């Protein structure tokens, strides 16, 4: 009953329902665990997925915790921390997980979440849950790249990996290779960066820190030893090395937004396709405009000038060597704990 | 008229007193129109200039106003239009200049004050008042350059000049040689602007517009139509020359000052001394500090917070899109107005 292990099957596959069966495994889950839709094909169900394999792990049915707010995204929706909605929504789950009584009904409250969540999300929470209990620490999650590379390669070569595995018997087969300097051409200067820009371990460290350090959750996670100062340092030793690649392909230092107003000269098209979703990110056009948002779904109704406006309370504030609490006292930002 | 041409005998030789040579006549000083140290000595001093010229002036003595204003900057103070306190003084003398009824009346009030009142406030205070009598137009009023040399050349040649003219005859005299580029050497890379920045006829510029536009003052000298747009619009115009010679000495454009904390990397030692005050303008070192101001003979008490918090709030008013009257009144920065 190695549910540590069992554990890391959930990251098996996010978008196969877990009764498809991950690795040589499969879950035995109840009936009323399966969702809605698969509830009346069970029987054929158990036919192929449960008896192919060589390990079958049994789930406890339990009572479950409200999971409305974390179902309450899409599971062909896009997910993002940094839209307030969706961080409130991550944050709840992981304080689900989190407060499980048992390592075997955080596998069984995984195995009913996991089908009905957003897998992006449930990627997230899961494993902002497993790095911070007790009784699930040095466990070896898997490479986000290597469960989800729909956010970290050229959305080109999934029909070449699909062509491959289904025409080529396995031990024949080669390995696809992963296109570089791809999302534009030598008429864009800053393509000479796509070392830095588009190199999955970099793109995995800004990923890994916010599972360490995520912005809203239970207090035990969200409250790290001077967290506000290492979000100042890490976003300011990116640039320093950001700016020292751009040194060495000749190109200036990166210059600021000089304001909120003015079009955004370099454009991005990052080529990349969400086969949760099944949605694109879409591009920006050279020379683009911010633009006020009214965003419905997401919850964002904010004008730029919204925007402008905390820049202003921010830097008055910098100006005065303190800010102002919620109730109107004074909090200075002295040597020590300023920057945090 | 003839005592249009008598105000313009008033900027010759500034700190000769009046009852010296001016140009090719003499004015007539009453008595009690000498300063105290010349009155007990004024029979002795009439006798001992003058009888070399051809023109005599009468100057009808006259009652004046009150002139303790002007008078309390010192003869030997250096003067400034920035300082707040200088400004003031400045308005009061304008005013008296604008306020006398004749041309003639005019000549008097000039004729008692020259050798009260600080030379380089004088030579500003009746230059701008000249410019805007309705009786003292479209005069040819001199060029502070040949008045004030000391504002504008390397005070090296001020020996030289005295030299030449007391060693040599006036028909035998070699014109001296003005320094280029005598403020910095090559080590620094700002020298190249020499023939911009200490162009006279660029500083001759800085200083006829703020005799034509000055910011304190009578109401009929300042309030020009879209004076607020002329400022914005002539000190952009400079930035803009500025830029392009820089791009013509290998230069980037012009960077600003990032804030008021950060030391001014680039030092400067304009090598001019002032011959009114008998003081340098001193130079600024390599990497100085902005410091809090008190200044307490010129009434300045000034922290660099007091600066801040006026760049902040008119940050403020720019996003808010309306700035806020002393009655709590909004008037708005629109298309027309608002850059005024
Ligand atoms: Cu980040
Ligand atoms: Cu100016």
């Not at 339990?62 to 995204?73: E, F, G, K, V, W």
């Not at 007790?134 to 959305?155: A, G, H, I, M, Q």
């Not at 730029?304 to 008055?316: F, G, N, P």
């Not at 060597?321 to 020590?336: A, H, K, P, T, W």
């Amino acid at each position: 009953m190695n549910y540590k292990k069992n554990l890391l099957l959930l990251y098996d596959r996010p978008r196969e329902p877990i009764f498809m069966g991950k690795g040589k495994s499969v879950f035995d889950v109840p009936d009323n665990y399966l969702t809605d839709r698969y509830r009346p094909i069970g029987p054929e169900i158990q036919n192929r997925f449960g008896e192919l394999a060589e390990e079958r792990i049994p789930v406890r049915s339990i009572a479950l915790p409200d999971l409305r707010i974390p179902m309450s995204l899409g599971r062909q929706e896009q997910f993002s921390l940094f839209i307030p909605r969706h961080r409130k929504i991550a944050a709840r789950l992981i304080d689900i997980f989190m407060g499980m009584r048992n390592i075997e009904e955080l596998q069984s409250c995984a195995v009913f979440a996991r089908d009905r969540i957003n897998p992006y999300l449930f990627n997230y929470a899961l494993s902002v849950a497993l790095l911070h209990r007790r009784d699930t620490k040095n466990l070896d999650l898997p490479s986000v790249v290597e469960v989800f590379p729909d956010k970290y390669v050229d959305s080109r070569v999934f029909e070449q990996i699909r062509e491959e595995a289904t025409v080529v018997p396995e031990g024949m087969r080669m390995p696809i290779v992963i296109p570089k300097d791809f999302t534009a051409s030598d008429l864009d200067e800053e393509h000479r960066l796509w070392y830095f820009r588009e190199d999955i371990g970099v793109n995995l460290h800004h990923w890994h820190w916010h599972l360490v350090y995520p912005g809203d959750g239970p207090d035990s996670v969200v409250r790290k030893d001077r967290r506000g100062e290492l979000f100042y340092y890490m976003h300011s030793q990116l640039i320093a090395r950001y700016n020292f690649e751009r040194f060495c392909n000749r190109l200036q230092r990166v210059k600021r937004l000089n304001n909120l107003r003015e079009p955004i000269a370099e454009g991005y098209f990052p080529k990349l396709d969400s086969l949760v979703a099944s949605r694109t990110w879409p591009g920006r056009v050279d020379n683009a405009v911010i633009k006020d948002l009214n965003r419905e779904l997401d919850q964002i109704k904010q004008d730029v000038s919204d925007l402008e406006r905390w820049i202003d309370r921010i830097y008055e504030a910098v100006h005065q060597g303190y800010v102002v609490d919620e109730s109107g006292n004074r909090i200075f930002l002295d040597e020590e704990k300023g920057i945090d």
